[PDB]
Amino acid sequence: GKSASGIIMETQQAKQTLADIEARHADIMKLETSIRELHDMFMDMAMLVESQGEMIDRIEYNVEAAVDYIETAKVDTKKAVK
Amino acid sequence: QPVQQSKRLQQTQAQVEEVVDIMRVNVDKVLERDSKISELDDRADALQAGASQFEASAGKLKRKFW
């Protein structure tokens, strides 16, 4: 009386739309997982290249003497005359 | 040939995955580089001393006679 057979299909179409909907959803969700991944890798490069950063800073200070030594003592071997 | 216009979502999907692989390679390479850059913080200090030894052998060599 209030609808009967009408409210019968007003659902058939609903179940469809929800089916179209969750469908699109899965695509998007799928894209979002690949993106988390691309994201995770990008974030690791920046923490990695930032580590090897300190290994290029110290490896600096230490060569900021290494040759500076074979320099301070470079001349000291001039007594090849004396 | 022309742009692309039939499944722009999947397109990005795919377009995103290629980038993922280009990055599996970069993460990998940054690893071979993290190791190499280890043998350097060693031999560095391992030569930062190899010199701090050729020095005293001159300050003392000099100061002495020869």
């Binding site: - | 990998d28 993290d34 190791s35 913080d41």
Partner: peptide, 28 residues
């Protein structure tokens, strides 16, 4: 050896980070 200690003791944790990362993505 005093130096070769910190040298191998460091490389360790470096390997702890290498694998952890290398596996996280599936390498070899």
């Amino acid at each position: 050896e005093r130096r070769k200690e910190k040298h191998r003791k460091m490389e360790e944790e470096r390997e702890e980070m290498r694998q952890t990362i290398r596996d996280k993505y599936g390498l070899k």
